[PDB]
Amino acid sequence: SSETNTHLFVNKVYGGNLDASIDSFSINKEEVSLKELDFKIRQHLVKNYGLYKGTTKYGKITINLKDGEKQEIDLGDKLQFERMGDVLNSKDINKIEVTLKQ
């Protein structure tokens, strides 16, 4: 029941504008489903950084894991149903980072 306090960066792209907030997540396990990983990421953006409320919905979440790995989950669509089996290591991740398009 590991409780790591990770830090993720938020950046809204209003075109030649960007309002960027730095902040934290809370992983309550030693290994988590990318589903739960994904349900938690948007859950907060949805409750905190204005997502799915207005021009917000299109973006790409970029999970950091190691000195060369960079992946995303289109916020344009929750169509990621096969990879939702994928599982991730708690103390591995280095820094989460999001970028917003309205």
Partner: protein, 1459 residues
């Protein structure tokens, strides 16, 4: 150009936020930062590969972090660091101070005041910089009211609520203000503090209140104030005649335990029918009376304290008022969210804000704003008076002066012009504004508007960004930065609006700025000459919306509870969370529980992590970034931060005597004079001036000032009683404050209910519950919940009652229903109690009050208890059960029966049958049975085992009075030995339970007993006899001694003990290695001539100090004290052997014994002593020494002695050092039959040595597997119990011998060792038999009614004229006859101290003092008031015995009435 912001400082274990943002061109480019150590960019703690691009508008964040590298204490490590960044286009870095201030410590004391003997519940909440659980190891360190550590302890952080262990208050602690501090075990400088006051509970006879005209003192009354003081008994009847004494004072605050009184504070206007009054021209009483002669010159407090002693009874009651804040002008301006640098050309926004003496906003008030300014041209300007008036919803009086750009500094004065106030008394301020100088002529101003004083979360911030002025508008981008709690958390860029000037910026206030926030905003200006940064910023108060909404709701939401009702409690949270309940008696805080704030209390403190400062924004883009609590990393401008870093702080006839205080030259002389005259008419002023020790320096200040006050009472005025009040500054408080509850922590995933019944008790419970989780820390709104029963009777039963006396059982039934009502109290007739029924006597109670009750009775059955009481009301009928203690007259206990069961004839013979018979003393108080106990335990060390493991709570092993310090030490003994025994002789396996835990409990029992004494510890580390008394060298050791003994298993404070030794030595060790005793303390009466005794008395001390310095020596092994140790032993050899007494010898023996046990000479001494012994049955079966020394009067009259057993201990100990195993077997055969059921009967000094023996020896010899098979039995009556003893049970139950028969303990065969004790108690009617060692006289006078009892010591043959050693006086008070509490304190509490300790316990007045000289008597006096109506009374008992030798008991009957 590039910007890289970062704090103005760093912290360890700090998630330091570091943004990078930049005006770089299209080419995206990499960026790695990191943290490197001073001049060698070698060490790099962490880094971050944060790549920017046009997609990220060239910006990015990085959580660096300096963990704990450099740990070399002493080295000035860590001071300064290099922050480093990297990229393709360049690289840069910096030096900027850092610290070890990570997180915070919150010390939730349960309640913030305690009385003797409560247990201070307490815990600690702890957060890191990031306001998360902050798991860690921490320690606090309690600190007595004088500032000397007293304990310590650490613990484990599982969640963040560090759960420390109860701290119990001393049975008699130092009175004042305690301090609890807290620090992280590991690295981190982080400071926790908190406090708590201990006050001395007293019993209230009658409630005296005191209400002041108003609550402050505004210029209206300054030559007057109407105070009304209202006294009244508990039985709903106000006082009539009473003397009134009222002091007053100044002070600074409410956290100051000391306030410099005033003279000429009016005595006497006689409380008159539940009142009286006065009016107090403040003018007079301060000018010459302290540093305040000016109204004005007062904005501090006014402290009040009355004393109302009732005229009829002779009682006394005291009552105080903390303070009464004076005020100049009832309003107080304070600028609001208004920065003090006016950018030029812009108009300056001045928002003042009036408030009242109570700190609410107050609208509709005038506000004249005179200003002044100077040109850059160094030309002045006197402006023109603007006047607004303060808003109604706002409390704000908005202004604006438009400023001639060439302005500079702007000084201005605000002030109310209330139309009704003296000009004088109009609240005002003054300030200063200054031009953000910038050579590019370029400035910035940002604003916004909201009508509410805070900006709720979720809202949105519209801020206008007017760059006004800059010679040009070629602005690319606006760039912002929002810190919060010392941490940047927001930043970005809005593309500038080409055409027009300013433009709006809209940042969503985020929960992440919860407590406050600042932001700042710079545009990068390309002056043709140089890259110029420019900015401004603001401070941003916001709504204290917590992270986790923790709320607590009571199942029955009723605003009052039935006392004992089961009632469910609710928790709740939008997120899983850790709660922490805590149910105080709301009483504490209470009387005007200052507005301040509940959850803000924390939120205030908690955000002093705001690195920056101000209303916002600086003086140079640098300054602006500075005050931001930042410094930033940019090549273009000077990212400096001048020198250091800004200690910013909140910009964002008894008078005729008191003149002779003119003889001040020291405090104590003031005490020599004050109490000096006090109130003594039973002895002249130079009679009292005799008993004066401290110094002749004061004796003058005594008799001078007494005479003055004595001629005086012949002129102020059968009622006369001078006074001049001064509680000596002692914390007293006429109210108890129950131990709190619901102190458990909890895990609550959004909901948790936990039902429970509330404690029977009259109070209002304030159950407050803090909760903490991953959001941070957040206080729930309290939830009061008074419990209370409408109407209820109480009965004031007495302690005890003598058979055959007629008692008056009082009490009072309580009405707290609004209207009045009808009741019906009836007493149940129990067998042997007498009464007036062969009944329902219905009465009426006026609403919201009380009707006294009474019932008379008279018991013939001694001990007979139980009385059920009952009242009746329309809607109720209740039964309160009570219990009456019934006694007889003249208690003496004779216990000398005792055996050792020795089946195996291991110690001198086979012992398998001893016989304790009936012996009714011909003085028996008829019809009272002879009660007797029979203590059968395995082992010679089983009595000393059972004592400590059958009761809990440490405890003294005699009936000896708790007075001394000594006694408070005699508590730590019985356990210590028993742990040294259990442990060192590993015998933990006695227990069927879990043993390891049994250990702890003993461990505790030790430490806590250990603190029990602190109170008697003086300043210079010298200990002392009775509290505060002149440090006694004797007890300075005796503690040393038992301090170093218990060091074995309870690490004692090094530097404490250290100085503790280095006191005796460096100061009290004569130029011959002997030790002079400081105080006047006589512990023991030594025999011999006045010359002899001196030489004798010197030896004894020098014997005892050694023992001490020895016992403890090992924790402060020290050259300078090893030395003295020999200088000491030397005197000892070189001065013992022409032996003066066996006692003398024996300590001098035992003490060399704890050293070089081989000095030929020691052999001679050991010989001498060893020579002196005597003995019982041949060959020897019992060996022991006598008090004397070869004068052989041989009077060992079948009876032990405190000094006897003390001596033989001292030899038995010496032997048991030298391992003389066969010499000793008879010595202990007889200790172990001396010792009195429970503990070492005779006195103290013996029974610690005596106990040290009996352990040491059962330690040194080897134990004899027990397996007896006892059978106690009546000679004629059939058999009583009989039980196979083993190592399973051996500390078996005690048993009282009921019937009337001769007794017989009588094991079968077996093995091991059983100490049969049998302590038989009987009540006799006469002392005519007994031995008087003290001359007495006791009688009850009338000049209402008061007791004058006397004494003189009866010197035994060979004894010095000086008379007694340390001694007590013990007066029994006739059933129901309270004595003058205030009378005694008088006797002791002074430099004319006739006694030195008083204490009324369970019906007895018990006085301690040093001597009872035999030149004449020594007499106490105190007065008494029948607390009720007592029939034919059986007299009480005035007794007087010498502390150290209980052998000297002259006991005597007397009666408090001639009837």
């Amino acid at each position: 150009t590039y910007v890289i912001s970062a704090p103005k400082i760093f912290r360890v274990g700090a998630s330091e936020n570091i943004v990078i943002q930049v005006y770089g061109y299209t080419e995206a480019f990499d960026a790695t930062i990191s943290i490197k150590s001073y001049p060698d960019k070698k060490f790099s703690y962490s880094s971050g590969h944060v790549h920017l691009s046009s997609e990220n508008k060239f910006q990015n964040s990085a959580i660096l972090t300096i963990q704990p590298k450099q740990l070399p204490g002493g080295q000035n490590p860590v001071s300064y660091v290099y922050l480093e960044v990297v990229s393709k286009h360049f690289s840069k870095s910096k030096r900027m101070p850092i610290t070890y201030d990570n997180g915070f410590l919150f010390i939730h004391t349960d309640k913030p005041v305690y009385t003797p003997d409560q247990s201070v519940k307490v815990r600690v909440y702890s957060l890191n910089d990031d306001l998360k659980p902050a798991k860690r190891e921490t320690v606090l360190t309690f600190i007595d009211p004088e500032g000397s550590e007293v304990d310590m302890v650490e613990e484990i952080d599982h969640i963040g609520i560090i759960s420390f262990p109860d701290f119990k208050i001393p049975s008699n602690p130092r009175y004042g203000m305690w301090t609890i501090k807290a620090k992280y075990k590991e690295d981190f400088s982080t400071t926790g503090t908190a406090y708590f006051e201990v006050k001395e509970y007293v019993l209230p006879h009658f409630s005296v209140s005191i209400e002041p005209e108003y609550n402050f003192i505004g210029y209206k009354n300054f030559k007057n104030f109407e105070i009304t003081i209202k006294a009244r008994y508990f039985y709903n009847k106000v006082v009539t005649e009473a003397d009134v004494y009222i002091t007053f004072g100044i002070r600074e605050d409410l956290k100051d335990d000391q306030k410099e009184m005033m003279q000429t504070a009016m005595q006497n206007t006689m409380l008159i029918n539940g009142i009286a009054q006065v009016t107090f021209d403040s003018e007079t009483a301060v000018k010459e009376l302290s540093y305040y002669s000016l109204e004005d010159l007062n904005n501090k407090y006014l402290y009040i304290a009355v004393t109302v002693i009732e005229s009829t009874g002779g009682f006394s009651e005291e009552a105080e008022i903390p303070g009464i804040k004076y005020v100049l002008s009832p309003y107080k301006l304070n600028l609001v969210a208004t920065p003090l640098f006016l950018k030029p050309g812009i108009p300056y926004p001045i928002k003042v804000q009036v408030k009242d003496s109570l700190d609410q906003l107050v609208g509709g008030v005038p506000v004249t704003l005179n200003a002044q300014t100077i040109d850059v041209n160094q030309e002045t300007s006197d402006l023109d008076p603007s006047k607004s008036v303060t808003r109604v919803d706002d409390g704000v009086a908005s202004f604006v002066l438009n400023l001639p750009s060439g302005v500079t500094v702007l000084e201005f004065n605000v002030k109310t012009d209330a139309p009704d106030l003296p000009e004088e008394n109009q609240a005002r301020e003054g300030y200063r504004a200054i031009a953000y100088s910038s050579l590019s002529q370029s400035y910035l101003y940002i604003d916004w508007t909201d009508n509410h004083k805070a900006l709720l979360v979720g809202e949105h911030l519209n801020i206008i960004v007017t760059p006004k002025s800059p010679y040009i508008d070629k602005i690319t981008h606006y760039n912002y930065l929002i810190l919060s709690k010392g941490k940047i958390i927001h930043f970005g860029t809005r593309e500038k609006f080409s055409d027009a000037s300013y433009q709006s910026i809209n940042i969503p206030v985020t929960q992440n700025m919860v407590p406050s926030s600042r932001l700042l905003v710079y545009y990068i200006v390309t002056g043709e000459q140089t890259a110029e940064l420019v900015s401004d910023s603001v401070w941003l108060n916001i709504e204290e919306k917590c992270g986790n909404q923790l709320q607590v709701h009571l199942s029955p939401d009723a605003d009052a509870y039935s006392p004992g009702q089961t009632v469910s409690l609710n928790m709740a949270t939008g997120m899983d969370s850790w709660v922490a309940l805590a149910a105080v008696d709301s009483a504490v805080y209470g009387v005007q529980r200052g507005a301040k704030k509940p959850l803000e209390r924390v939120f205030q403190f908690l955000e002093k992590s705001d690195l920056g400062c101000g209303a916002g924004g600086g003086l140079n883009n640098a300054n602006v970034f500075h005050l931001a609590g930042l410094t930033f990393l940019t090549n273009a401008n000077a990212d400096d931060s001048q020198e250091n870093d800004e200690p910013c702080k909140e910009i964002l006839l008894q008078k005729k005597i008191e003149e002779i205080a003119a003889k001040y030259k020291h405090s104590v002389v003031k005490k020599c004079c004050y109490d000096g005259a006090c109130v003594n008419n039973d002895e002249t002023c130079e009679q009292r001036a005799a008993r004066i020790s401290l110094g002749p320096r004061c004796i003058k200040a005594f008799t001078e000032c007494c005479v003055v006050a004595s001629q005086l009472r012949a002129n102020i005025s059968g009622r006369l009683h001078m006074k001049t009040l001064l509680p000596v500054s002692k914390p007293e408080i006429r109210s108890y404050f129950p131990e709190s509850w619901l102190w458990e922590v909890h895990l609550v995933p959004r909901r948790k209910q936990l039902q429970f019944a509330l404690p029977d008790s009259l109070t209002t419970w304030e159950i407050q519950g803090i909760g903490i989780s991953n959001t941070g820390i957040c206080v729930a709104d309290t939830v009061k919940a008074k419990v209370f029963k409408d109407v209820f009777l109480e009965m004031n039963i007495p302690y005890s009652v003598v058979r055959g006396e007629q008692i008056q059982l009082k009490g009072t039934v309580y009405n707290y229903r609004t209207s009045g009502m009808q009741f019906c109290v009836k007493m149940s007739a129990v067998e042997g109690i007498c009464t007036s029924e062969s009944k329902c006597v219905r009465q009426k109670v006026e609403g919201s009050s009380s009707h006294l009750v009474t019932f008379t009775v008279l018991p013939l059955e001694i001990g007979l208890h139980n009385i059920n009481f009952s009242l009746e009301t329309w809607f109720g009928k209740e039964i309160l059960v009570k219990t009456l203690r019934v006694v007889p007259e003249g208690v003496k206990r004779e216990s000398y029966s005792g055996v050792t069961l020795d089946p195996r004839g291991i110690y001198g013979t086979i012992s398998r049958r001893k016989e304790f018979p009936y012996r009714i003393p011909l003085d028996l108080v008829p019809k009272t049975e002879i009660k007797r106990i029979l203590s059968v335990k395995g082992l010679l060390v089983g009595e000393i085992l059972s004592a400590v493991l059958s009761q809990e709570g440490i405890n003294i092993l005699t009936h000896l009075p708790k007075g001394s310090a000594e006694a408070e030490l005699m508590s730590v003994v019985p356990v210590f030995y028993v742990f040294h025994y259990l442990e060192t002789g590993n015998h933990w396996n006695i227990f069927h339970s879990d043993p390891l835990i049994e250990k702890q409990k003993l461990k505790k029992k030790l430490k806590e007993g250990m603190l029990s004494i602190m109170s008697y510890r003086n300043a210079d580390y010298s200990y002392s006899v009775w509290k505060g008394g002149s440090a006694s060298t004797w007890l300075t050791a005796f503690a040393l001694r038992v301090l170093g003994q218990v060091n074995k298993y309870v690490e004692q404070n090094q530097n404490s003990i250290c100085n503790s030794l280095l006191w005796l030595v460096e100061n009290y060790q004569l130029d011959n290695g002997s030790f002079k005793e400081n105080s006047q303390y006589q512990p023991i009466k030594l025999q011999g001539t006045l010359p002899v005794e001196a030489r004798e008395n010197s030896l004894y001390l020098t014997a005892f100090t050694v023992i001490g310095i020895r016992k403890a020596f090992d924790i402060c092994p020290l050259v300078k004290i090893d030395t003295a140790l020999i200088k000491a032993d030397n005197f000892l050899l070189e001065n013992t052997l022409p032996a003066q007494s066996t006692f003398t010898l024996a300590i001098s023996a035992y003490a060399l014994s704890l050293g070089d046990k081989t000095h030929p000479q020691f052999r001679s001494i050991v010989s001498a002593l060893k020579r002196e012994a005597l003995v019982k049955g041949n060959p020897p079966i019992y060996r022991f020494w006598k008090d004397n020394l070869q004068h052989k009067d041989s009077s060992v009259p079948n009876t032990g002695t405190a000094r006897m057993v003390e001596t033989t201990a001292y030899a038995l100990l010496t032997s048991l050092n030298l391992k003389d195993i066969n010499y000793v077997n008879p010595v202990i055969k007889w200790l172990s039959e001396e010792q009195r059921y429970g503990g070492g009967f005779y006195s103290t000094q013996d029974t610690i040595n005596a106990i040290e023996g009996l352990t040491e020896y059962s330690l040194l010899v080897k134990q004899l597997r027990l397996s007896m098979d006892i059978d106690v039995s009546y000679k004629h009556k059939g058999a009583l119990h009989n039980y196979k003893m083993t190592d399973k049970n051996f500390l078996g139950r005690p048993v009282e011998v009921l019937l009337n028969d001769d007794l017989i303990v009588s094991t079968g065969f077996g093995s091991g060792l059983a100490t049969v004790h049998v302590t038989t108690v009987v009540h006799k009617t006469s002392t005519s038999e007994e031995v008087c060692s003290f001359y007495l006289k006791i009688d009850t006078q009338d000049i209402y009614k008061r007791i004058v009892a006397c004494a003189s010591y009866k010197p035994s043959r060979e004894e010095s004229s000086s008379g007694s050693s340390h001694a007590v006086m013990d007066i029994s008070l006739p059933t129901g006859i309270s004595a003058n509490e205030e009378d005694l304190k008088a006797l002791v509490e002074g430099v004319d101290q006739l006694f030195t300790d008083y204490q009324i316990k369970d019906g007895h007045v018990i006085l301690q003092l040093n001597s009872i000289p035999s030149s004449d008597f020594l007499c106490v006096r105190f007065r008494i008031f029948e607390l009720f109506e007592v029939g034919f009374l059986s007299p009480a008992t005035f007794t007087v015995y010498e502390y150290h030798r209980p052998d000297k008991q002259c006991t005597m009957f007397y009666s408090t009435s001639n009837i």
